[PDB]
Amino acid sequence: RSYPCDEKKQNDSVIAECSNRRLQEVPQTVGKYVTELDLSDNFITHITNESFQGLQNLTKINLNHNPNNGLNITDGAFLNLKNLRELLLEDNQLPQIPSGLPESLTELSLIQNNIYNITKEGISRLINLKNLYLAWNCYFNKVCEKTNIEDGVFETLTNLELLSLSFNSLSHVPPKLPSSLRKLFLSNTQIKYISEEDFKGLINLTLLDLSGNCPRCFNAPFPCVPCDGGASINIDRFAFQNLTQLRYLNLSSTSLRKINAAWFKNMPHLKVLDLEFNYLVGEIASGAFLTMLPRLEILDLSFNYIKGSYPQHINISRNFSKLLSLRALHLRGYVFQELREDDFQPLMQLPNLSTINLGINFIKQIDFKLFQNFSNLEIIYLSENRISPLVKDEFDPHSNFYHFTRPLIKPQCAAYGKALDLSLNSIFFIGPNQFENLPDIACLNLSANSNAQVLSGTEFSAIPHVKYLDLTNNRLDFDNASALTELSDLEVLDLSYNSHYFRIAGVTHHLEFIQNFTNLKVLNLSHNNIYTLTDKYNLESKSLVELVFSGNRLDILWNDDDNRYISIFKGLKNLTRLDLSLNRLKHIPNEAFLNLPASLTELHINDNMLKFFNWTLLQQFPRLELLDLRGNKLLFLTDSLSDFTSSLRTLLLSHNRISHLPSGFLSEVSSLKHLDLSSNLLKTINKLSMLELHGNPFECTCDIGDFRRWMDEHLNVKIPRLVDVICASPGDQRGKSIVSLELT
Amino acid sequence: RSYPCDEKKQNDSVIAECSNRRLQEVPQTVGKYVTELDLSDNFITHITNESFQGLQNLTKINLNHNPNNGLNITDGAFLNLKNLRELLLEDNQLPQIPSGLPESLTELSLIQNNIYNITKEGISRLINLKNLYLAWNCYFNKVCEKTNIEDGVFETLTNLELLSLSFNSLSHVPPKLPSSLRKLFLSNTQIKYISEEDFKGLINLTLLDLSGNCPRCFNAPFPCVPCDGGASINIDRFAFQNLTQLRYLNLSSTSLRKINAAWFKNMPHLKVLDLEFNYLVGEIASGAFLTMLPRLEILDLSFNYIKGSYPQHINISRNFSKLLSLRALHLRGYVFQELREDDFQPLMQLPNLSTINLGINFIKQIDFKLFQNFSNLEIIYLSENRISPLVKDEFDPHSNFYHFTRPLIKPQCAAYGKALDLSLNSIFFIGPNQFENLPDIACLNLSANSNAQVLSGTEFSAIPHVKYLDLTNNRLDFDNASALTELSDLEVLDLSYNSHYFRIAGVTHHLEFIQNFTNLKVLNLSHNNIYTLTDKYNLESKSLVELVFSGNRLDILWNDDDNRYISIFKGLKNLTRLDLSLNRLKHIPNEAFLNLPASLTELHINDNMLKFFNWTLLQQFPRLELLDLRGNKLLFLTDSLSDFTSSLRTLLLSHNRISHLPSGFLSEVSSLKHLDLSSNLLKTINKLSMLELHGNPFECTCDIGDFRRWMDEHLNVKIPRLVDVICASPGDQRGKSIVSLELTTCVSDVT
Ligand SMILES: *[C@@H]1O[C@H](CO)[C@@H](O[C@@H]2O[C@H](CO)[C@@H](O[C@@H]3O[C@H](CO[C@H]4O[C@H](CO)[C@@H](O)[C@H](O[C@H]5O[C@H](CO)[C@@H](O)[C@H](O)[C@@H]5O)[C@@H]4O)[C@@H](O)[C@H](O[C@H]4O[C@H](CO)[C@@H](O)[C@H](O)[C@@H]4O[C@H]4O[C@H](CO)[C@@H](O)[C@H](O)[C@@H]4O)[C@@H]3O)[C@H](O)[C@H]2NC(C)=O)[C@H](O)[C@H]1NC(C)=O
Ligand SMILES: *[C@@H]1O[C@H](CO)[C@@H](O[C@@H]2O[C@H](CO)[C@@H](O[C@@H]3O[C@H](CO[C@H]4O[C@H](CO[C@H]5O[C@H](CO)[C@@H](O)[C@H](O)[C@@H]5O)[C@@H](O)[C@H](O[C@H]5O[C@H](CO)[C@@H](O)[C@H](O)[C@@H]5O)[C@@H]4O)[C@@H](O)[C@H](O[C@H]4O[C@H](CO)[C@@H](O)[C@H](O)[C@@H]4O)[C@@H]3O)[C@H](O)[C@H]2NC(C)=O)[C@H](O)[C@H]1NC(C)=O
Ligand SMILES: *[C@@H]1O[C@H](CO)[C@@H](O[C@@H]2O[C@H](CO)[C@@H](O[C@@H]3O[C@H](CO[C@H]4O[C@H](CO)[C@@H](O)[C@H](O)[C@@H]4O)[C@@H](O)[C@H](O[C@H]4O[C@H](CO)[C@@H](O)[C@H](O)[C@@H]4O[C@H]4O[C@H](CO)[C@@H](O)[C@H](O)[C@@H]4O)[C@@H]3O)[C@H](O)[C@H]2NC(C)=O)[C@H](O)[C@H]1NC(C)=O
Ligand SMILES: *[C@@H]1O[C@H](CO)[C@@H](O[C@@H]2O[C@H](CO)[C@@H](O[C@@H]3O[C@H](CO[C@H]4O[C@H](CO)[C@@H](O)[C@H](O)[C@@H]4O)[C@@H](O)[C@H](O[C@H]4O[C@H](CO)[C@@H](O)[C@H](O)[C@@H]4O)[C@@H]3O)[C@H](O)[C@H]2NC(C)=O)[C@H](O)[C@H]1NC(C)=O
Ligand SMILES: *[C@@H]1O[C@H](CO)[C@@H](O[C@@H]2O[C@H](CO)[C@@H](O[C@@H]3O[C@H](CO)[C@@H](O)[C@H](O[C@H]4O[C@H](CO)[C@@H](O)[C@H](O)[C@@H]4O)[C@@H]3O)[C@H](O)[C@H]2NC(C)=O)[C@H](O)[C@H]1NC(C)=O
Ligand SMILES: *[C@@H]1O[C@H](CO)[C@@H](O[C@@H]2O[C@H](CO)[C@@H](O[C@@H]3O[C@H](CO)[C@@H](O)[C@H](O)[C@@H]3O)[C@H](O)[C@H]2NC(C)=O)[C@H](O)[C@H]1NC(C)=O
Ligand SMILES: CCOCc1nc(I)c(-c2ccccc2)n1CC(C)(C)O
Ligand SMILES: CCOCc1nc(I)c(-c2ccccc2)n1CC(C)(C)O
Ligand SMILES: *[C@@H]1O[C@H](CO)[C@@H](O)[C@H](O)[C@H]1NC(C)=O
Ligand SMILES: *[C@@H]1O[C@H](CO)[C@@H](O)[C@H](O)[C@H]1NC(C)=O
Ligand SMILES: *[C@@H]1O[C@H](CO)[C@@H](O)[C@H](O)[C@H]1NC(C)=O
Ligand SMILES: *[C@@H]1O[C@H](CO)[C@@H](O)[C@H](O)[C@H]1NC(C)=O
Ligand SMILES: *[C@@H]1O[C@H](CO)[C@@H](O)[C@H](O)[C@H]1NC(C)=O
Ligand SMILES: *[C@@H]1O[C@H](CO)[C@@H](O)[C@H](O)[C@H]1NC(C)=O
Ligand SMILES: *[C@@H]1O[C@H](CO)[C@@H](O)[C@H](O)[C@H]1NC(C)=O
Ligand SMILES: *[C@@H]1O[C@H](CO)[C@@H](O)[C@H](O)[C@H]1NC(C)=O
């Protein structure tokens, strides 16, 4: 049982996680076998040549964010560790590259420090370096007006594949870079001119990042100072003529008015070109460079809008048809009124185009017919446009800062088929022609359309094979038992955040339409504040697997004088996961709890106000693996759980007021694998494989020693976060983990 | 201050407020001199003939919401009170109208009870009744399928001016109503037919409410069961022929397809007609009845839309020009695409039309020229339409439930002149032609337009005389010192909830444009999360009276390493009211606090996390009347406040961790009128006119008795919620108010 580091097996080596544990120095109680040590987010201030004694087998050390004054690393502190490959020293307030680093180093990271001098003394001996990260060092500091890069400091590094000097005031591409380089990151370097010579010899390079050099300002979470007179980056005609291996060019936020087609003459393999936050409305219209990119897969031209120009049409060159390899186009924030069928003629041939991103263009009209003309289109993303009803009579320094990195559409949605995201549009009601002349849509997002309409069950007729449907953040009036019945194939329905009309007494609430879905698996009714239904008072489905019922008023339903809702969930005969969280429940009528489906594997009733829980009733739930009761006001446990369940694997009781464990509890219940008793009022204790106890106010006075014995006996039971299992009393202990006491 | 009722003198009579004080029975410690007694929101269950013994001067009793099983009122319990005019008995669970009520009664209220029988025995003796309220009695109850109204039960009441039977299952207008009736309220009564006879003799009537009878459902906070086959209310041809005095007709939510113009034949004075939540798209187009309303001032036709119909145009009859007296038209929720100049020709003549309400119509285009064709138009309300950028050219049972009762536009805005509310529209940027062909606008609402634009100071050129401007709930990029400079004459600016771009480092933040406003009085920057400005680091104005700076990051600004923001507010030389609430302040640098304007009358720093407050620095603030420090983490008071201020009138210190009052604090500071020490950690105490102490964990052990003396001596000092000034200790006291102890016999230990 390791302290204070949770030591774990990974492939063919032993990892130590000692992150975020208030450690004031490198623990010397680290396993002899360990090869990778994480000490990030701690309060360590000193690293001596004695800090890693008896640990010669370390290949990786992480010391990032230490402390939370500065980190003091002595000369040749690591030099003894002859097998050290990966050394991470980020956000340590380091004033110089620590001297005497081990020549075995392949990956060094010094991001977010006060390193102004990049010296031969520091790194020229590190001739095994593959990856060097030096970003965020001389970045808008008043002490340092330019990073000092000793001449030829990198040329000895003939194994260096990745160099990163992003977010440093360089002003000039450093000379004498090693030919070995595959990826050169120079984003936000204040480099305004790129010469013929700058990237000479770099004939192996696959990625170049010149982003944020002469920036166009928009939404960056770091400072944005445009080049004087809004001037673009000046890139010589031939600067990239020897870069024949380049796959990834990032020119985001360089204020480019014109793109020289010469730049791409000897670059036949370019796969991903990033042109976000430039002034290229012209070049998108009459693009020379579009002919030079036959192998391009990802193009991004987002936020190239002309300030104040709301053109009627988007002007797209016919040359866009010479992007034969294109898989994904990103045309966000161009800002235009209408997309005509003809405007997108150039794109209809491209055999591999799967993703069109027209987000944040404030488009009013789209000839939706034009989306049938596309071979392998999987993702139509139109979020933040102005599609009306149709009737017609603090940040991650490692992130990609200029590109949408996460999926445009939830993978769980896209999985089903062609995905259409019309979220944050103006479809205030679904018009009769709303989805006419549309491919077979599988995945549809109508989230946040200020839609507050009634559903007759004839809105989705033109796209009847929708499987995943998001109607979240609307004010839909569920006034009709026919609502959504036209969608027979439907498997996932998200009605989250439609509370408006569910709160209103002067309108009926019909949820019977659920019953008509033979294929429906997952229904989300979170945050609808449901307090009544009319006519049919039970939810019923033979198919449904998961119901989210959180943020509703079961408190009101299960306290109906005529017990109308006592079996609201029973008719869900195939339900395995039910979420009753945030329903303001104080007491659950035994009858009502006994009418929860017998099929339940996983029941969440967390974040209510339960004082009592009739453990007896678990007898009626023989498939129940997981019970979540966290964040209630529970006081009492059964003292005979074994009599009530043979099924229960995981029991979560975090954030209750439990002060005493029954004598026969921890022992017995052979099914129980995971028990969570963290953040309770346990003063002392007095098969399983995880036991959480952190945040309990333990009396550390001899009586505890009995439990401390049991921890040493049962080592198979993982007690996580031992650092946070603290003594409340007595006064001299108030602070120590309960693994610090003696026996006297 | 009598216990437990706060007695107050008002216009030669004494009111007793004993509401919301957990009283389990009528207190017998009420002054004989009292004329009005409020006992609402208590736990009283019994009213006997001994409940108000003496107390002969009582004219008004309020017993509403008592308790929170039922209220038990004995026969002739009030009969002794020979001067009882107003008796309020609302939400008491009463099973019958209490027998033997006093004949002196003029106003009786019995709303929200279980009164199924309206008997002659109960009310026929009450021949002085002006106002009887019986709403919400037999309302969707399973015991009672109809209210039983004894025949002729009201006809003895020849003084009855107001009768209310709203929200009761009647099914038929009761017969034999007194001719004295001025206002008859029959809303949600389930009355489907109205006969010639029903309102015969009611020749004095000024108001009739038939709303909610055959309802159209939309947003009502009470049940809505439409008449079978969506049938409208059936009102006979001549039902209103004797109602020549009627001013107010309410036909809201009666599902009316057709409005018989006969109804208004002998009704020449009708002032206010309410037709919300009907099916009158036709009648608005044709409209016989429009010729019959020469004196109408308020018409409301809101929510008459045809479900699913998004017509290109609104069809209003030419007859709308025969509404000569109209002051306000309410056409919400008709739902149409375009308003053309000619669509509103019939309204342009009407000499007195001041308010057009086109809310929630989802209009895409408006010929804004057409609003110059109006004589006395003061309010153009277009909230919740779809006006795009232009580039080319627990409820209140007493409420009015079917009408917008509050002002369409904040009075503070309208006051300045012609008001245009484009809130909750689609003006994502202000186009160059956005406010062209528009009257002289004084008051402009652009709130919640998903507007996320840069301002060049050329957007408002076409309406340069805007005085009140609301830009709230947008994502405006204040990246320009020229922003809004075209609006000279500007007095009020609301920039509340525009935090988006103020949180973003990769954008400049210019607030210099304030300086260019010679007339600017009130500036609201609430909830903008301001943590930096570029170039100009101080706010400066010779004119500004009020700055709201709440929900910003003064924590970050006043902890700038180079002290850039130390005098951010000093250049506001005329400022009297400053709000620093919700700025996450733990400590205020003495320099920074000393650079707050000297002109400050009223400083709010509530809801921060302050541990310390240098009371000394108040010396530099000689005009300071009101200091709000509530909801901080303060521990200490000055012990010599008098040395630091002669100005301070109101000091709010609720929700701190203050555990001791200095001996010389309460005494001294003759200016102090209101002191708030509620919800602190005071164990004991040891000019003014209000002192709040409720929610302190008081030791009720002899030491307290000193204070209890001081309360009896200084009776002028109102201590509100004495009921909630509770003993924490010792164990035997934990629950009693500190006015329940005996000074003769207490304990000394348990400290
Ligand atoms: C079908 O249509 C008809 C209309 O054609 C509707 O009938 C109306 O119904 C409403 C709602 O019940 C009635 O309003 C009530 O009227 C009371 C009398 O008001 C008048 O006298 C006072 C002077 O004493 C004036 O001030 C009023 O004018 C305005 O004055 C100020 C603004 O300057 C406002 O405060 C007023 O609201 C008026 O706009 C009138 O000339 C009125 O007192 C009563 O007010 C209570 O509720 C309001 C808001 O909730 C509070 O401001 C107020 O405080 C009252 O409530 C408490 O406060 C007082 C004093 O502090 C206490 O004494 C109370 O006990 C209580 O604790 C209310 O607004 C309206 O009068 C009536 N129209 C006519 C002509 O009769 C039907 O309802 C409609 N049917 C349906 C189903 O909607
Ligand atoms: C952004 O910040 C701004 C400003 O910081 C903020 O806008 C202000 O919002 C506050 C409230 O949030 C407003 O203050 C209130 O104003 C109420 C209305 O005030 C007027 O009308 C009062 C009564 O009207 C009667 O008389 C007229 C004619 O005589 C008659 O026609 C009417 O029908 C009616 O019968 C009137 O009393 C008042 O005048 C007062 O002004 C001074 C104050 O210094 C005082 O000395 C006077 O003696 C007098 O009281 C004014 O003309 C007002 O009722 C309200 O007041 C009280 O009672 C409530 C509780 O019932 C309390 O909450 C309150 O403390 C008061 O005791 C209150 O004062 C203010 O007007 C806004 N300012 C502007 C410019 O609009 C925005 O809300 C912020 N925005 C966001 C998004 O947060
Ligand atoms: C200009 O445009 C260029 C592209 O033209 C762009 O370059 C790309 O930058 C991003 C951001 O730095 C790079 O993304 C990272 O890539 C590495 C390597 O990925 C490969 O290897 C891993 C397996 O090790 C595979 O999963 C992956 O499929 C690739 O084969 C990844 O390590 C990064 O993943 C982590 O970081 C993400 C961002 O924080 C996390 O979300 C993710 O969970 C990973 O973090 C976790 O694991 C990390 C492992 O080291 C660990 O360190 C973290 O703490 C955490 O536990 C990330 O995807 C991308 O590779 C570059 N593209 C190319 C082709 O090289 C520039 O960024 C852009 N310029 C600007 C200024 O934006
Ligand atoms: C309305 O309610 C629905 C139903 O709850 C919500 O949609 C679900 O959201 C949950 C998360 O809250 C989704 O579950 C997550 O899916 C991720 C991806 O799953 C795929 O990949 C995994 C392997 O990674 C496969 O097992 C799986 O078959 C899928 O192929 C997971 O990565 C998520 O976390 C997992 O890993 C972490 C460890 O980091 C663990 O903590 C988790 O326990 C878990 O193992 C997680 O499983 C779920 O897929 C969604 N369902 C559907 C049908 O879409 C909506 O979010 C909700 N709507 C609103 C508006 O609130
Ligand atoms: C510009 O347009 C905006 C957009 O409409 C407008 O904002 C509105 O202002 C008023 C106050 O000035 C808001 O009214 C309040 O809103 C709160 C929200 O929680 C309500 O709780 C309050 O009403 C309660 O009391 C009623 C009593 O019966 C209850 O029935 C009711 O349910 C509430 O509990 C209170 O009225 C209004 O909500 C906003 N609306 C929005 C969308 O922000 C602003 O006034 C306009 N600016 C100018 C200059 O006029
Ligand atoms: C349908 O449309 C909406 C809006 O486009 C999608 O909502 C967005 O979904 C993403 C991913 O779930 C949310 O990302 C989150 O951001 C917050 C940061 O505030 C972070 O806390 C979360 O961890 C997560 O990263 C995003 O906020 C959300 N946007 C809005 C406006 O709600 C929705 O996912 C779409 N549906 C489908 C099925 O694709
Ligand atoms: C009572 C609930 O109403 C919901 C609803 N469903 C539909 I189809 C409509 C509707 C009505 C008129 C025009 C266009 C569409 N409406 C009404 C509005 C637009 C107000 O939501
Ligand atoms: C970064 C600041 O950008 C704000 C801004 N102010 C204006 I005038 C515009 C704008 C841009 C193009 C077309 C129409 C209008 N925009 C940008 C958008 C519309 C994206 O918000
Ligand atoms: C460039 O990479 C190739 C393999 O892709 C390698 O054989 C060659 O040695 C590298 N060139 C230099 C000069 O390091
Ligand atoms: C399209 O991609 C597929 C694999 O997804 C590949 O086989 C095909 O050759 C690609 N075609 C072009 C023209 O890039
Ligand atoms: C409910 O939907 C059905 C089927 O489309 C329709 O005929 C009916 O009019 C709807 N009912 C209501 C109350 O809107
Ligand atoms: C649990 O409920 C059952 C009946 O459903 C009842 O017999 C028993 O009293 C309850 N158990 C506890 C511990 O309250
Ligand atoms: C009101 O009544 C009492 C006796 O009923 C009388 O003595 C008293 O003088 C009256 N109130 C006032 C203010 O005079
Ligand atoms: C109308 O009202 C007044 C009371 O204000 C009364 O004098 C008159 O007689 C009433 N008319 C009838 C017919 O009752
Ligand atoms: C218009 O209002 C004025 C005063 O506001 C009034 O004298 C007149 O009666 C009204 N005019 C008409 C035609 O009703
Ligand atoms: C108040 O501030 C002044 C300086 O402005 C300082 O000298 C004094 O010590 C402060 N008082 C306290 C109690 O901190």
Residue numbers in the entry:
A (entry chain A): 32 to 99, 112 to 436, 460 to 752, 763 to 820
B (entry chain B): 32 to 99, 112 to 436, 460 to 752, 763 to 827
Give the published text.
Toll-like receptors (TLRs) are highly conserved and crucial components of the innate immune system. Particularly, human TLR8 mediates antiviral immunity by recognizing ssRNA viruses. Particularly, TLR8 also plays an important role in the antiviral immune response through recognition of viral RNA in endocytic compartments. Previous reports have shown a two-site activation mechanism for TLR8 with ssRNA degradation products.
The efforts described herein culminate in the fortuitous discovery of a tetrasubstituted imidazole CU-CPD107 which inhibits R848-induced TLR8 signaling. Aiming to further understand the molecular mechanism of this unexpected, unique, and dichotomous behavior of CU-CPD107, we successfully obtained the crystal structure of the TLR8/CU-CPD107 complex. CU-CPD107 utilized hydrogen bonds with A518* and V520*. This newly identified compound CU-CPD107 inhibited TLR8 signaling via stabilizing its resting state which was the same mechanism with the first TLR8-specific inhibitor CU-CPT8m we have reported previously. The distances between the C termini of the two protomers of TLR8 dimer (TLR8/CU-CPD107, 50 Å) was similar to that of the unliganded dimer (51 Å). Superimposition of the TLR8 structure complexed with CU-CPD107 onto the corresponding unliganded TLR8 segment (residues 32–816) produced a root-mean-square deviation (RMSD) value of 1.2 Å. First, CU-CPD107 (100 µM) alone was titrated into purified TLR8 (10 µM), with no detectable change in heat observed; R848 (100 µM) alone was titrated into TLR8 (10 µM) with an observed Kd of 35.7 nM. For comparison, R848 (100 µM) was titrated into TLR8 protein (10 µM) premixed with CU-CPD107 (100 µM), with no heat change observed. These results indicated that CU-CPD107 hindered R848 binding to TLR8, in agreement with the inhibition observed previously. Therefore, we rationalized that ssRNA converts TLR8 to its activated conformation, and CU-CPD107 binds to the secondary site instead of uridine.
